[PDB]
Every structure is written in structure tokens, then in C-alpha cells.
């Protein structure tokens, strides 16, 4: 029913140089209530390559997903592949079961036109929501990733993409999710679809229609969310928003103010939260460096490097990928956090083995795996 905010800046004092301050906003949902008033838009690829276990498992998972969504929500279902086909628009689930059962495989993949249609449908109404997308191959209408960069996605609509198999374009889906504060799930086995797709249903939330505005006297740059302002349809689990802000030399005063607004999903009340980053000028270097939260600097750098890692594997720069994961290891071990240390081992782990195999087959695989993991680490649990 509510949201709590802890906001931390890396620097307490400024000094003689332009400084790259980094900040973290931790948003915690409290006493979570049933999620209602959301518009789920499902985009299912039914191309020829989908024939078999992939599409039957997707159909069953879709029905289970519809079962899991609470009742006060609207559902749209699209099937795209040779042409876009709307099964239902802004409706309820009972309509779809019979139609889901008649889905057939066949045709190319027209992801661009399906996304355009999903955007139009989302923009037909004033509800936040989600775009649940499953595909197993590249788009055949628009394979250029830059085109998916330029789309005007609906605000407060998070894209949950399920990339199936070894033939889709992980970089394109990453662009989609990055532009929509979304999540990319790599699915290597169709089995995974049956347990994973229903989890994209949001049952209980701490806030609805969240708006994070950042009023700064200097340039502000978010790491893992579009904005500022950040427009999140809902808060289901802890949100960590990372960003950078240029602290000018010898600055003193109110550097930035973060205003968070949201709707109580139960009381339907507008709550507004306000945090101030007040900085002073340091008159000594030891006095300036003691004002640095080095753990936050290391955490921000860690996630920066992880984003770079996804990009580098997408670019086949395995050498830089190795150097990057190594730095992530050093950061994890410097923070003495078991969770980060293992996560980084598991990744270095894979990168070294791919360098062993030294084939596009394997590089392209771990690219998918790690590209998904980046989005998951940066925008959930």
C-alpha cells in the first residue's frame, strides 16, 4: 500500500575538480496489496520455427498466466508472425482460452508491426501495464536494432521479453527492455517457458503509477532506468535506481532534490516523497575523501561494468569482456559480499569457457545468457 525511499549520494563534500558523484535510490514496497487496473498486452510469435514444443508450451503458459493475473485488470492478446492478429483487445481472460487453443504455427516473424500495434493498443487507454513478448527468431520486417531504439513506447508500460532458443537477437530485445524499464528472460529450453511465463503476472504491489523526478542544478544521468523522470507502472519488489550527477568544483549547497510521487494501490491516495542532496565544500583532502561512500562507488561501478559486459558480448569483444568481468571480480571481493563474489565467478566461469570453445556458437550463447542476466540484476529482486 506504500513505498519507502532511501536515497544516498557518493560524496558528502566537494573539492577543486569536477566530480562524478553517483547516487542510489532504494525503493521498498510495504504492506503490498492486490494489483489492479493494469493492461497486459501479450505478443506471441507463431512463426514456422515455433511449430512443436515451443508453441504448445507457450499456449499453455499463456493460459496459466491469464489465470494468475488478478481480476481487476485488462488483457490484450496479439499473435504476430506472418501478419499481426488481435485475439482480444482491452478485455478479460475468458474470451481468449478458446482462441488461444486455435493458434497455429507458420509464417515469418513481423515483430516490428506487432510492437507498433501493441503500442497503439496501450495508448488507447490511460492505464499502466505490461507487454509480455515471446519470440524465437529475428524480425523479418525490421531486423535493424536502431529502428527499435526510435519507437515511442507508452509510458508506464514495462516490456517483459522471453527470448526463446538460439536464433533470436538478444541485442534487439535488450534495447526494447532498456527503453521500457523491462526484463529480458533467456529461455534455452521450452520447458522453462511453462514455469517462467506465468511469473510475469504481477499479483501484489506496493505502489502504482510511480513518478521519480530529479531536479538538479547539473547534468543527471540514470544507469538502469529511462529518465529522469522515471515512470514506473508499479513497484512489486525492491527497486534500485542508480545514477550519476556532476558535482561542480568547490560546490556547496543543494545539489539536487528527488521528488517521488505514487498512488497507494489500496487507499487510492497520492503520496509524495522528497529527498535533498546537500553538499558542502571540503577544506582538506583527507576531509574530502572521508566523505566518500566507497561501497556505493563500488556498487555503481559494478553495475556499470555489467552493462558494459552485456554490450561487449553482444559485440563479440571477448577480450574486453574478460577484462571487464575481471574488474567485476575485484569489486565483489573488495566488498566482501558472498553474493556478488559467486555471481561474478559464475560469469567468469562462462567467459573463460567460451574463450576455450572460441566459436560464434558459444559466444552468441553466453551473450544471450548474460544479456538477460544484466537486465534481471538491474531491474528486479
Amino acid at each position: 500500500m506504500t513505498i519507502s525511499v532511501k536515497a544516498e549520494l557518493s560524496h558528502k563534500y566537494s573539492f577543486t575538480s569536477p566530480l562524478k558523484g553517483v547516487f542510489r535510490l532504494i525503493i521498498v514496497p510495504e504492506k503490498v496489496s492486490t494489483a489492479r487496473g493494469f493492461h497486459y498486452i501479450i505478443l506471441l510469435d507463431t512463426s514456422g520455427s515455433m511449430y512443436g514444443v515451443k508453441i504448445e508450451t507457450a499456449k499453455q503458459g499463456a493460459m496459466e498466466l491469464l489465470s494468475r493475473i488478478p481480476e481487476g485488470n485488462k488483457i490484450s492478446f496479439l499473435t504476430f508472425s506472418n501478419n499481426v492478429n488481435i485475439l482480444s483487445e482491452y478485455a478479460d481472460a475468458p474470451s481468449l482460452v478458446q482462441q488461444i487453443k486455435q493458434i497455429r504455427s507458420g509464417g515469418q516473424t513481423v515483430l516490428y508491426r506487432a510492437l507498433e500495434r501493441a503500442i497503439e493498443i496501450a495508448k488507447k487507454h490511460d492505464l499502466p501495464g505490461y507487454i509480455i513478448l515471446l519470440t524465437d527468431g529475428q524480425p523479418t520486417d525490421v531486423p535493424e536494432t536502431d529502428a527499435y531504439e526510435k519507437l515511442n513506447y507508452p509510458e508506464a508500460y514495462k516490456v517483459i521479453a522471453f527470448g526463446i532458443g538460439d536464433d533470436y537477437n538478444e541485442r534487439l530485445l535488450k534495447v526494447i527492455t532498456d527503453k521500457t524499464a523491462g526484463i529480458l528472460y533467456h529461455v534455452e529450453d521450452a520447458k522453462e517457458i511453462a514455469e517462467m511465463l506465468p511469473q510475469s503476472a504481477v499479483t501484489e504491489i506496493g505502489a502504482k503509477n510511480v513518478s521519480i523526478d530529479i531536479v538538479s542544478e547539473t547534468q543527471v544521468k540514470l544507469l538502469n532506468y529511462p529518465g529522469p523522470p522515471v515512470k514506473l507502472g508499479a513497484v512489486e519488489s525492491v527497486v534500485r535506481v542508480y545514477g550519476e550527477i556532476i558535482i561542480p568544483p568547490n560546490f556547496t549547497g543543494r545539489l539536487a532534490t528527488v521528488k517521488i510521487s505514487y498512488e497507494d494501490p489500496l487507499s487510492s491516495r497520492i503520496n509524495r516523497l522528497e529527498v535533498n542532496f546537500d553538499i558542502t565544500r571540503a577544506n582538506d583532502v583527507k576531509r574530502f575523501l572521508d566523505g566518500i561512500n566507497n561501497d556505493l562507488v563500488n556498487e555503481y561501478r559494478y553495475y556499470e561494468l555489467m552493462s558494459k559486459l552485456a554490450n561487449q558480448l553482444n559485440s563479440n569483444n571477448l577480450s574486453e569482456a574478460t577484462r571487464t568481468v575481471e574488474q567485476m571480480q575485484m569489486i565483489a571481493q573488495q566488498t566482501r559480499r558472498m553474493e556478488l563474489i559467486e555471481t561474478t565467478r559464475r560469469i567468469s566461469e562462462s567467459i573463460e569457457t567460451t574463450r576455450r570453445i572460441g566459436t560464434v556458437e558459444q559466444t552468441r550463447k553466453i551473450s544471450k545468457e548474460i544479456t538477460s542476466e544484466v537486465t534481471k540484476k538491474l531491474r528486479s529482486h
Binding site: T16, S17, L19, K20, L289, I292, V297
Partner: peptide, 27 residues
């Protein structure tokens, strides 16, 4: 040698980074 040192802190900062990672000072 092809790295750069930060003056405010004492970190050896790669020419890859324009800002110091330990302290945030500009190149």
C-alpha cells in the same frame, strides 16, 4: 607508461576512464 594518476586521490586511472573511479575527480 600509458595510465594517468589522480592528484586528489592517489589512484592510477586508466586512460579509458575520464573520471577517477576511487574519488570522482576529472582527468
Amino acid at each position: 607508461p600509458s595510465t594517468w594518476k589522480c592528484n586528489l586521490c592517489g589512484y592510477e586511472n586508466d586512460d579509458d576512464a575520464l573520471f577517477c573511479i576511487k574519488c570522482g575527480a576529472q582527468k
